[PDB]
Structure formats: C-alpha cells, structure tokens
Amino acid sequence: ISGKTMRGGPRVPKAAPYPYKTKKYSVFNAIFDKTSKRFDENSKVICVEGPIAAGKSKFAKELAEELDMEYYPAVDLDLIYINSYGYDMRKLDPQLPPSCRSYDVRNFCLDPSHDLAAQFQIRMYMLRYSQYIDALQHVLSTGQGVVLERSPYSDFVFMEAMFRQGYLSRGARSVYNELRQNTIGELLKPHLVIYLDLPVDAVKKQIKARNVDYEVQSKVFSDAYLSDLEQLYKQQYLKDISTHAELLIYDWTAGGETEVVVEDIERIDFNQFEADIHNKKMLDWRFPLEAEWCEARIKYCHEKPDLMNYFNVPRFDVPELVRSADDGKVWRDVWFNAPGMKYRPGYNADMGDEGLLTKTKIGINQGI
C-alpha cells in the first residue's frame, strides 16, 4: 500500500514466510505457529478492472513492482490443455469432434456461435476463482500483498455480456448465474479495486494495435459487446465492490501515471477504517483473534480441494453442458493414455520420472 520510493528502499517481511507452496498446513500446525504475526501493512488485495484490450497486465506488473506485491498473471485457459510436460491437448485433433475438441479464446473470437464455447465460459470463471484462492494463499502465508489483474467477482460481466449478444444459452446464463453464488460466497472481497475507463471506440483503437490474428481479424468485436463491459462495470460489477472495497477510477492505463496512482493509493489509508467493526466496508477482513486468523489461513492452505469441490454441481438439463457417454468414455481414454498423464505428476515414469520405487511424496493441493 506504501511505495518503496517513500520507503527510501525495499520493504521487509516482518517474519519468516511459511513455505505454503511446498508444505501442508495443519490445525496442529496452527497451534504450533501463529498467523497474523507475519501480517504487515501491505497484506491486502488490489484488484484491477478495465474494458478488454486495456493492456493492464503491464500496469499491474509495474504497480506490484514498485509497491512490492505479487503480479499473478492473467487467465491462462491453456492450463487445462497443459501438463507436467507442457504439450497441448489441443494437439489431439478432432478424434472426438462434438464436445471433446478444444475451445480457447481464439476459438471464441473466431466463432462464439458454437455451443461448446459455454465450456470455457464457466471453466474460465473457475480459473479466475482458483487463481483468487492462490492469491489468498500467498497473502495469508507470507503476509505479502497481491494484485490480481481480474477477478471471479468481475467475470459475470463478460458472462451477461456474451449472453446479451446471444452467444450463450438461456440455460447457460441460469447455470452460471446461480452457480456463482455457490462458490463466490466463499471468497474474501479485495481491499481495494482500481477500474480503468476508456470508451468503446478507444479500446477498439488499441485492440487494433494488438494485431492478433485470432482477435483483431475476428468478428466478435461489435460496439455492443465491447460496450456491455462498460455498463456492467459501471453499475452492476462496481457497486457491490464499491460497498466493500475502496474504489478508485482514473481515466485509463495509458494516461494512467503509475506514480500518481501510487500516491493516490498510498494516501488512501485504512487505519482510518479501523473504526467500528460492524461497518460493512472492509467487512470480510475483520479477524478478531489470532485463532480466527488461523481459521482463515487453514481454510485456504488446507481446504483448497474443498474449495474446488464446491464446483461439483449436477446439471444434466443443459445439452451443450452434457457429454456423450461413450464419446466421453473415449475422451477419458485419450487424456489418461496420452503422453504424460498415466499417473500423478512426478510418477509418469513412462515420460521420464526417476526416483520411483521409493518415492511416495505428494504436493499440497498437487492437482489431483
């Protein structure tokens, strides 16, 4: 929250960070090690928003660079298609054409008419949501601040946006809209939210400067679609965050001067907000006791599987969301017979793992 420049140097972690990447957290461990001890000034979440093609990745990178937080790169839909040895399951051709063949943002931009697009439309929310928990994991373990370029909280903007265009199904809009509640209740809202505001034309200027053969030549980029971002951001998405997180809105990144943004954020302090607890703003961060800190900490360092399993929602009332059994059976055959998927990561000795016959270790929230 405070810039290194006003520190005349770097920031220090108040206590030794906990190896949450490689270590499991236990309730025994909570008794054996306190949580908010590590916590410091910057222990907060600064979320970013803006109309698409706002280039905010470089902004957030520099902002986290000169305020000493984590960047946490943006959505990476490919990770579904990536594995312990990289290669793309998109490599696997339309052997199983109907609903097993891939769909990336490229495919969406080339054609949002395909019902299979709805797949990532929800899986994209999960990726955001999984990232968010990663951010909370990093906060509560290290006490260091974080900056997510985009949030699951904001994802519904694109959701209603695509549906208004007609691309998603009336069924899918209900599915995602109700399903957000199920998980979205279980996340802490960010401390601070910064939203960037260019007009639809202006972003079209920049998106034509992105020169992306799967976007710039695409056809989705109607003013209506790229404007629905504006209305939804303006009122629908902002207001609830405006209730909880402190909201700053500069014009945009390009004229957005980092240093003044640095100064404006730093000027906005929260000790002012250490008044009455019952205040609804910052509400999701008032942790009374060190024990309650540890409850939040263990709940994210030891219940990420639980967090993922909330997604298990049964809905076989939507055809595009249903899969053909026998085809799906083959889709299972392809994935787990394909190179580097037979076993757990680190145990695909067919693809190279050594040290087996004695190795019995498994990583905290290690995928499977």
Binding site: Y343, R344, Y347, T360
Partner: protein, 58 residues
Amino acid sequence: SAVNDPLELLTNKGTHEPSFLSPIWNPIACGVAGVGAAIFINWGFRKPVFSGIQKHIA
C-alpha cells in the same frame, strides 16, 4: 466307550495336529491384506502399485 461322559468327551485328549497351514494362515492373511491395501493405495492415487515399496513392506 459306551458311556457318554461329558468331562472325558471335553478333555483335551489330543489328536489335533496343526496343518502346515494351521498356524501360518493368519500371517499370510494379514500381510497379504496390508500388501493389497498398499496396492489399493497407489491404485486410487494414480501412482504405480509397485512404486514406494516401503509402504508395502511396512
């Protein structure tokens, strides 16, 4: 005898020879269970059943 004697009928007069299997059966049942359980462990975890024989030996 011609005399249904309860005590002598009950008495451990012997004539009970254990098999080569009679005592050994439990050891080669519990160990077989534990070995199979370890194979069960790796089978569900998507790990090689052979791998990590330290679990199987223990």
